[PDB]
Amino acid sequence: QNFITSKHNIDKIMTNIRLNEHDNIFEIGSGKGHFTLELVQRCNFVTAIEIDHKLCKTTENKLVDHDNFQVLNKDILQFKFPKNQSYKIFGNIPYNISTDIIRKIVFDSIADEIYLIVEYGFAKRLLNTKRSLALFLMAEVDISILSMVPREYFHPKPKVNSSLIRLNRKKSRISHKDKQKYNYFVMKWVNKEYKKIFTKNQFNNSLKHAGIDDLNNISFEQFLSLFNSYKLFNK
């Protein structure tokens, strides 16, 4: 629900999306095909993943004059993305499953660049180093809010505005080796269960060592410093 159908608005949004003629794209949710139509004209090939079969049909009808696409009536959460292919993602996604979609495409796909339209508050949370999802994502991708999408652009009109965000894949900051240890550290840190990860002395030394003077506001680099100190203290 909450589709964007004004061509005028669609163009303004596409203006911030820098996908090119040679990129293969996976669209999360096709809606009635309003963005799908733009993507196929802009990009090399588009694979739209849509759970609702009627929408798949509508999208298909809207793109009748295009050949560089396919619509798959599947569940994004169960979809298996390519493993030896360069591709990007775009998605005007539902708030209710935003968290699951993003973990799915960031942790279970190798898309090197992802463009998503999410609620304004959700987007802000993804950059908040006090939250676990943000800390897990920042180890795999860089995140940036590109523009604000007014709720008037949607229908039904949501009660809050949205944001167009971009996630860029980068070399993981956490080795596959420190996976479990990182997951534990993140959770205990966001829950402020400091005692389970640092003795009082290690805690203070780690903070000064990371240059953190205000616990209520730490950069991701500072958090990584903390995780590194955590590793050192524990063999």
Cβ neighbours for 26, distance < 8 A, ≥ 6 positions apart: 46, 47, 48, 49, 81, 87, 88, 89, 90, 109, 111
**Residue written as tokens 């090197």?**
112
The verdict on whether 27 is a catalytic residue reads no
Per residue in 45-56, is it b (16+ CB within 10 Å) or e — as a string?
bbbbbbeeeebb
9 annotated as a binding-site residue: no
Sign of the Cα pseudo-torsion (95, 96, 102, 104, in order): negative
Cα 68 from Cα 115, distance rounded (Å) = 20
145: Cα within 13 Å, side-chain hemisphere: 16
Active-site option among 33, 90, 92, 119: 92
Cα 132 from Cα 116, distance rounded (Å) = 20
Active-site option among 87, 154, 182, 227: 154
Can you read off the two tokens belonging to residue 183?
């997951």
- How far from 98 is each of 23, 31, 117, 152, 174, CA to CA, in Å? 24, 15, 10, 20, 24
Experimental method: X-ray
Cα 132 from Cα 183, distance rounded (Å) = 9
92 annotated as a binding-site residue: yes
Residue 61: burial class (beta carbons within 10 Å; 0-12, 13-18, 19+): exposed
234 annotated as a binding-site residue: no
Q: What 8-state DSSP symbol labels residue 77?
A: G
The verdict on whether 21 is a catalytic residue reads no
Active-site option among 26, 27, 31, 50: 50
Q: Which of 206, 186, 203 is nearest to 195 (CA)?
A: 203
The CATH number of domain 126-139+172-235 is 1.10.8.100: yes
User: What is the CATH number that goes with domain 1-125+140-171?
Assistant: 3.40.50.150
- The full set of domain ranges for the chain reads 1-125+140-171, 126-139+172-235
- Count the neighbouring beta carbons within 10 Å of the beta carbon of residue 222: 18
The verdict on whether 50 is a catalytic residue reads yes
Resolution (A): 2.2
3-state secondary structure of 143: strand
3-state secondary structure of 184: helix
Helical residues (DSSP H) of 70-178, grouped into ranges:
98-107, 120-126, 132-137
Cβ atoms 1, 94 nearer than 8 A: yes
The verdict on whether 95 is a catalytic residue reads yes
Q: What 8-state DSSP symbol labels residue 131?
A: S
Can you read off the two tokens belonging to residue 38?
């733009």
Edge-to-edge, what's the strand order for the sheet holding 88-92?
69-72, 45-49, 24-28, 88-92, 113-119, 162-169, 141-149
218 annotated as a binding-site residue: no
Active-site option among 95, 194, 220, 233: 95
